[PDB]
Each structure stands twice: as C-alpha cells, then as structure tokens.
Amino acid sequence: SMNPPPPETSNPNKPKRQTNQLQYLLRVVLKTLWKHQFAWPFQQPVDAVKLNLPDYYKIIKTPMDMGTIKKRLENNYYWNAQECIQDFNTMFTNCYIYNKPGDDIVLMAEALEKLFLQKINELPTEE
Numbered sequence: 001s002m003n004p005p006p007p008e009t010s011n012p013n014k015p016k017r018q019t020n021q022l023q024y025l026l027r028v029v030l031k032t033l034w035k036h037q038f039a040w041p042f043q044q045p046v047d048a049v050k051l052n053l054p055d056y057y058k059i060i061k062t063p064m065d066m067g068t069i070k071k072r073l074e075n076n077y078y079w080n081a082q083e084c085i086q087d088f089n090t091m092f093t094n095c096y097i098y099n100k101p102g103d104d105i106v107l108m109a110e111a112l113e114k115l116f117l118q119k120i121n122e123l124p125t126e127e
C-alpha cells in the first residue's frame, strides 16, 4: 500500500540525447495524448494510498505514467525515441496487467494506446 518512489526523471550517469523524433514525442505525441478525455488517470504515478490500491505496487514492479514520461522528455532523459516509446508501452501494459478486460480503466488505456499507435505510425526523420 505504501507508495514507492516515483521513477526517475533525471539521472546524471545516464547519457542524454535530443533527437527530432524525441522532440515530436513531446510536442506532438505526448501533448496530444495528454489532452484526451481518458488521459487523466495516466498523468501522474498511481497514488496507491489516495486511490486505495494497496496491492498496486505488489503487482506492478515497473510503474510508468505520462507525467513521468513528460518529465523525461523535457529533461532529455532518453537516448532515442524507442526508449520513450517503450515507457508508453510499459504504462499501457501495466494497466492491462493490474486490471482485467472490460474494466473502465482498461477501455481508457485501450483507446489511448490506439491513439498513441496512430501518432507514432509516422515519426519525423533524423537530421
């Protein structure tokens, strides 16, 4: 039930990078998803104390949220787009893992994933 430390958004011994794809992930992809009607559950780490999910972090061992992702992008925390895309997939996957099909929260994630996949279907080309 106690909340774990949120995932890092900076790390001095991790190399940082800025790429055109990563810029697009923040400017277009993340900030578009953010505004979706179903984004609000995924805009911050899950507060298992607030939401009364004392088993959340007993089940999910790689939490991830769009708020974390947003900070990581603004901080150049990622090396490449694929690293950032993998965080999105972790966030959707966590939601399917902790829940079951048909749940309102899963329908939310399912929709966001389709928009996400639509937006990353075509990324800009590297410079």
Ligand SMILES: Oc1ccc(Cn2cnc(F)c2)c2cccnc12
Residues within 6 Å of the ligand: 041, 042, 046, 051, 095, 098, 099, 104, 105
């Ligand atoms: O990422 C999440 C954020 C919030 C909640 C609580 N909650 C909010 N709205 C519904 F419908 C549920 C989650 C519940 C299960 C899995 N993930 C969750």
